[PDB]
Amino acid sequence: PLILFNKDNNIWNSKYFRIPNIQLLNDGTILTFSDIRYNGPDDHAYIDIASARSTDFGKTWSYDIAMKNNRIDSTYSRVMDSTTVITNTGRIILIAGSWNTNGNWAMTTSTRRSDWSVQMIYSDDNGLTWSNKIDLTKDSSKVKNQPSNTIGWLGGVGSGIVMDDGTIVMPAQISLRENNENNYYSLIIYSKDNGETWTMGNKVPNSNTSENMVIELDGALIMSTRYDYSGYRAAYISHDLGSTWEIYEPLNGKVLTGKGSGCQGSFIKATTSNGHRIGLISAPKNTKGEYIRDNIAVYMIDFDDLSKRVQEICIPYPKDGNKLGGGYSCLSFKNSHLSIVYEANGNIEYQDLTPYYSLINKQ
Numbered sequence: 360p361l362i363l364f365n366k367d368n369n370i371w372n373s374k375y376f377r378i379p380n381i382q383l384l385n386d387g388t389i390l391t392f393s394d395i396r397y398n399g400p401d402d403h404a405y406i407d408i409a410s411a412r413s414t415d416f417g418k419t420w421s422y423d424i425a426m427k428n429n430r431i432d433s434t435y436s437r438v439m440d441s442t443t444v445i446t447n448t449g450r451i452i453l454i455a456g457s458w459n460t461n462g463n464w465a466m467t468t469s470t471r472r473s474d475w476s477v478q479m480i481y482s483d484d485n486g487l488t489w490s491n492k493i494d495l496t497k498d499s500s501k502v503k504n505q506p507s508n509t510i511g512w513l514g515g516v517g518s519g520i521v522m523d524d525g526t527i528v529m530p531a532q533i534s535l536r537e538n539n540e541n542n543y544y545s546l547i548i549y550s551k552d553n554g555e556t557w558t559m560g561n562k563v564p565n566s567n568t569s570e571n572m573v574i575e576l577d578g579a580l581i582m583s584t585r586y587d588y589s590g591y592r593a594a595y596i597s598h599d600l601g602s603t604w605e606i607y608e609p610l611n612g613k614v615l616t617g618k619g620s621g622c623q624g625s626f627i628k629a630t631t632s633n634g635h636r637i638g639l640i641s642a643p644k645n646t647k648g649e650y651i652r653d654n655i656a657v658y659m660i661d662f663d664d665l666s667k668r669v670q671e672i673c674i675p676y677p678k679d680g681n682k683l684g685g686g687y688s689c690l691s692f693k694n695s696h697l698s699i700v701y702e703a704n705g706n707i708e709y710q711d712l713t714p715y716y717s718l719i720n721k722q
């Protein structure tokens with residue numbers, strides 16, 4: 360596997376990299392992103408977001424800082440936890456959470472986190488240049504239906520999707536003040552104007568749900584989400600673009616995640632040549648438990664053959680994760696090719712998994 364972001368050799372002299380993201384572009388360009396965790400693995404620290412771009416199918420890469428933090432606090436200013444999407448115009452949108460003080464985004468404050476915002480950039484030239492940062496939360500002009508009891512929110516970490524009519528959907532995660540406690544939930548946001556403005560959906564049925572992605576399936580939204588301390592990824596389905604949700608049994612509880620906290624993973628849809636819609640999930644098996652997050656595996660479900668049990672396809676990272684921060688991953692599927700980026704001992708690694716997709720496609 361290629362070391363895409365190397366803690367021991369990078370142009371920022373960063374000590375650590377976390378939270379990878381990948382988009383396979385329609386023209387075969389590969390675009391990735393990662394947190395630049397300059398001073399170490401910590402979440403609550405000084406972080407920018409890098410991009411790495413390749414025009415030779417992953418052989419070589421051009422590196423840039425795609426988004427800088429607000430530069431207010433030399434210890435705690437951070438933009439992090441990328442969620443991306445490619446719209447039907449080819450626009451590439453990146454949404455990140457932004458803070459500049461110590462303390463977990465969801466649980467530190469009982470009121471709206473005052474240094475918290477969601478920042479968005481977009482590229483109309485296939486990832487070469489980015490807009491200025493657009494602040495989606497400083498006023499009420501960009502995101503409709505944000506709850507009054509919001510402590511904070513950000514993207515689901517991974518990729519969004521496009522519905523049939525071109526509606527853009529982003530997975531998201533929110534922290535809500537409820538009966539003198541902070542509870543966190545997954546949900547989605549969507550845009551009907553190519554990302555300029557958004558509407559927030561409503562929360563999923565269980566708290567302790569956070570990082571997630573959704574796929575589209577015949578107008579429905581199906582979520583696979585990190586469900587902390589349950590031991591598995593939860594799954595929900597919405598038939599009204601994220602306004603209501605119910606448990607989606609074929610995937611709910613089917614990907615096990617070991618003892619302890621959950622972990623981010625990715626969840627994408629492919630259509631094989633026989634017309635079947637399949638779901639692919641990347642996540643650590645975490646057989647050793649808690650933050651070890653060993654064995655980042657890729658799983659497959661066939662939505663047109665649901666009596667067939669979820670199958671482990673391969674394990675792209677058959678190793679223990681680093682307890683300081685590891686386990687995260689992101690798949691991207693486009694034009695019968697499949698790629699993954701993932702955390703690997705403080706680095707980000709890259710693999711082309713298209714040979715495994717060919718095995719599934721049976722051609």
Ligand SMILES: CC(=O)N[C@H]1[C@H]([C@H](O)[C@H](O)CO)O[C@@](O)(C(=O)O)C[C@@H]1O
Pocket residue numbers: 378402439440456463464465569570621622623684685
């Ligand atoms: C904004 C933020 O803190 N993001 C981080 C989340 C949250 O801390 C948890 O989901 C609890 O909220 O989890 C990580 O620490 C993890 O599990 O490896 C990494 C990620 O960057």
